[PDB]
Paper text:
NbUGT72AY1 is a promiscuous transferase that glycosylates bioactive hydroxycoumarins such as scopoletin and umbelliferone, as well as monolignols involved in lignin formation and various other small molecules. Five distinct GT protein folds have been identified that are capable of GT activity (termed GT-A to GT-E). NbUGT72AY1 adopts a GT-B fold comprised of two distinct N-terminal and C-terminal Rossmann-like domains (shown in cyan and brown in Fig. 2, respectively) of seven and six parallel β-sheets, respectively linked to α-helices, connected by a linker region and an interdomain cleft. The catalytic mechanism of inverting UGT such as NbUGT72AY1 is a direct displacement bimolecular nucleophilic substitution (SN2)-like reaction enabled by an enzymatic base catalyst.
Moreover, NbUGT72AY1 crystallized in the presence of scopoletin (III), UDP (IV), and a mixture of scopoletin and the non-transferable donor UDP2FG (V). Complex V and IV represent the SI and product-inhibited enzyme complexes, respectively, as they were obtained in the presence of an excess of substrate (scopoletin) and product (UDP), respectively. Asn372, Ser373, Glu376, Arg249, Ala351, and Trp350 frame their donor binding sites and in both structures, the indole ring of Trp350 points in the direction towards the uracil structure of UDP2FG and UDP, resulting in a π-stacking interaction. In all UDP/UDP2FG-bound structures (IV, V, VI, and VII), the indole ring system of Trp350 forms a π interaction with the uracil ring. In all structures that have scopoletin bound (III, V, VI, VIII, and IX), H2 has 2-3 turns while conformers associated with UDP (IV) and UDP2FG (VII) have 4 turns. The product inhibited protein structure IV and SI complex V show closed active sites with distinct electron densities for the residues from 310-326 in IV and V, while catalytically active VI and VII lack electron densities for this region due to the high dynamics and the loop may remain open. The non-productive complexes IV and V are compact, fully resolved, and display a closed active site. Phe53, an amino acid of helix H2, interacts via π-cation binding with Arg214 of the UDPG-binding pocket and approaches Trp350 4.1 Å in SI complex V and 4.0 Å in the product-inhibited structure IV, while the distance is larger in all other structures. Aside from the closed active site, the amino acids in the nonfunctional structures move closer together, resulting in a more compact complex and a higher number of non-covalent interactions. The lowest number of interactions (total edges) was calculated for the protein in the presence of β-carotene (II), while the highest number of bonds was obtained after addition of UDP (IV_A and IV_B), which is consistent with the assumption that the carotenoid promotes protein dynamics, while in the product-inhibited complex the mobility of the protein is hindered.
Author numbering:
A (entry chain B), B (entry chain A): 5 to 477
Amino acid sequence: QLHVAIVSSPGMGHLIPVLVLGNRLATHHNIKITILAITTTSSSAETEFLKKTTLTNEEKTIEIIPVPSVDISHLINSSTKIFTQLRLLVREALPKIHSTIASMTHRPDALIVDIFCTQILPIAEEFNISKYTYHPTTAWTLALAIYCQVFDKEIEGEYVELKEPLKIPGCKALRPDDVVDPLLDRSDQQYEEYVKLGKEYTDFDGILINTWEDLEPETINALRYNEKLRLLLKVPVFPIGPLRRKVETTLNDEVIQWLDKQNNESVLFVSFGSGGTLSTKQMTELAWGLELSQQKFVWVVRPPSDGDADSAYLNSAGKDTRDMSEYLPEGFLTRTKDMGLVVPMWANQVEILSHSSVGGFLTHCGWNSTVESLTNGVPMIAWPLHAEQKMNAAMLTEELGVAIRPAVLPTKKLVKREEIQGMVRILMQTKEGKRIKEKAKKLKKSAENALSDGGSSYNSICELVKDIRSREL
Amino acid sequence: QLHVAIVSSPGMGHLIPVLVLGNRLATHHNIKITILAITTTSSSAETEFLKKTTLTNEEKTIEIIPVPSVDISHLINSSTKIFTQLRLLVREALPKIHSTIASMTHRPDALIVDIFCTQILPIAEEFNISKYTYHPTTAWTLALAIYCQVFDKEIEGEYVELKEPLKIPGCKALRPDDVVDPLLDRSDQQYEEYVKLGKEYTDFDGILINTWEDLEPETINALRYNEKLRLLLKVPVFPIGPLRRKVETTLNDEVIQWLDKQNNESVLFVSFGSGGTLSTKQMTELAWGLELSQQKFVWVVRPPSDGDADSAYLNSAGKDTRDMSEYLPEGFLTRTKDMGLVVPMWANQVEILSHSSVGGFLTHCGWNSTVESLTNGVPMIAWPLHAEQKMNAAMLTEELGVAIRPAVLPTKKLVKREEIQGMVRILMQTKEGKRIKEKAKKLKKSAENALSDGGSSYNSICELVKDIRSREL
Ligand SMILES: O=c1ccn([C@@H]2O[C@H](COP(=O)(O)OP(=O)(O)O)[C@@H](O)[C@H]2O)c(=O)[nH]1
Ligand SMILES: O=c1ccn([C@@H]2O[C@H](COP(=O)(O)OP(=O)(O)O)[C@@H](O)[C@H]2O)c(=O)[nH]1
């Protein structure tokens, strides 16, 4: 039985994919897993989440080892982007990770490292341990990241200022609009960190991705066979998705109990992930749009911010004492007493999304969220905010046909309550709504097939374990 | 009942479309047809093809009259392109065609002339007979040909040296790379012959094309309604395609018998049309790529040439006595004894492509070939060589999504056996392969709809017969 160590980047958005991957391997592929989870400075949430997961392993086939964050406040400023921040954190923690692996009683045979932990190459190489990246999102975004080194040299000026879509060899073309956050401003350090990340991928022995063949056959084939791309990559790709939490059934969840009282596929779940937050004006538009729709809803709400759309990613612990009602339109909660259920800070998305009464998901198009929705056969309103979400949203709406979206990107134009209402009703009242759901259910099934024995993703994991064992010479 | 005469240009590429058109009109539109087929000096292929078609007409509603080629060796030289050659041939045969039509017991009411026979205007006009061109290819190429008169005056220097794509009003933009052969070298006489051809179209009473509305709705609309284009065209367009041979089921075809022994959609058919030939180096790369793919194949091979990619166009009868094995890598045939079947010179392409075991087509993107594939629901590897094929290949790969292709044009960069293998496996092993096939089958159905009663193409033929009868005042 192999020992594999998986390094998790800071934040729940990265920690969860890693935990899920480790669980997947331990359960379905009979592997010992050690998750090296890079912690954030301010979340007893993340830490106690880890304590609850360590408590559940009687079988110790999975073990969790936290990596304490190094203080980088002296390295950053008010304009430093989360991309850059995570990269820096990882880099500054590399010595600690070295000492950890060195101090391990029994070494890992392999090391799989989250998207931001690509800077840990030297440690794996030094110890002579098989090294892979986990890209817990789309192959499209991976292809963009890799080929970005080429774009950097072939394109002058900002990508956002281009007239023609970016053509990644063998992939679907990307409009300036839908680019990932690093490519928005090339003058920003996160951009160069990103081009660098794109290159760093290729230095690993392989790349796991949380997608599958059915979902992205063309992009995956491009990574494997497109000659321009392969000139850059030259290492195996492992579509192993869609990996997500299996639903833990809680009898004491009042949200679930409200949902039990609802009709099948009658509820819209509304959430922008752990990181997402809306502006005051947009959150107001949203409150009223939901009201106007007269559809039933469950809405995870956070205090609004008119700054960065992911500014709640590291700052969810910042104790804003204000009640929900204070940053909602007055009496909204009084008027939607029957119609909806407003949830503070976080909820068990998965358990919610698996509930029969849920029939719609207004999402930021975070890949974890997306996967969770699709695997439960839920159609979506695409509301991209940060990271790669615009790109995923383009994929979801245009190509896959499992989501609808505003005429202009939410991050570009205010989505008014009239449009919000209209979208919500399309999803929840109309036949367009039905057919979106059917497609999402088809994707649900294709995903179930990929993960089930002999599926592309099951097999891709077997190929991975092969790759690892062939390297243990 | 109308009498229509259809003039065919030299070579199988042109003769077949004309035969098919005549058959289509005679059968489905109850018309008397007389096909005036301009012959090549050396093809028992062309002649026996004619014998097979003459044998089928007990009803003589279609009759075939050969036009013997005139000797033009004194008019050409070693640098004279096939474009120019065909134009000259036609021109020099014009008197003979005149005497033929003049000597006809009962005149044709109309005259439809192949792409290269646009120089027969004077004969039709003189006799006062309705005159049309048949453009047995894409509307995109037609639009380019017509608008080329404008490009000539608006662009200085070579098209191949332009930075921006050529924009034909109302159509998809064309990269320098994908231009038709005449536009490659403007200093060449074939270029001016081509600009001239583009203009000549517009002097006819109408233009038939072997495409349909579903396939090229926007280009067709542009021809009809774009003001810039209409300033040049001002005559009706008739999308009547996709017209091709109906499959004649042949007793002692050994290729068909090999195919019978194969699995469904397990065979790659490989062919570069009547004209196409590969360089020695490329044909070697190809042999090995097919070998490496470990996919089953049927491959129509011709002796290689490092010169003109269509240099087998007028030499298709010339029995080069060299065995296949002499211009293939040694023992290739010995090693692929089980895996493939290498065919010399010609093959019932239509009957092969309709065979259940055929699941892939590596093609030069000749429009007849393309149509044959699409109408049988076969996905393609786009390998453009000559004429307009690059442009068709762009259309097939980028827009339609029914073909895959090399990173760089085959005629630009050597396609190595690694890439060949990869492409072949994408098509024949992967899910990308599956979905390309489904799209090709959707096109198959849309085509079936166009041709069936009341379809755009059926109707376009009815519109044509209307046009002819309104001109018989
Ligand atoms: O109320 C919430 C908000 C978020 N999440 C989870 O937290 C992550 C969202 O974080 P992020 O904004 O990075 O989006 P992602 O790309 O992870 O979906 C996903 O795993 C969601 O399942 C959740 O379970 N409940
Ligand atoms: O081995 C071969 C090669 C070509 N063809 C036929 O010859 C015609 C030539 O059309 P193509 O698309 O190849 O155009 P070209 O490039 O020859 O002008 C088509 O009907 C093909 O089916 C055939 O029957 N067998």
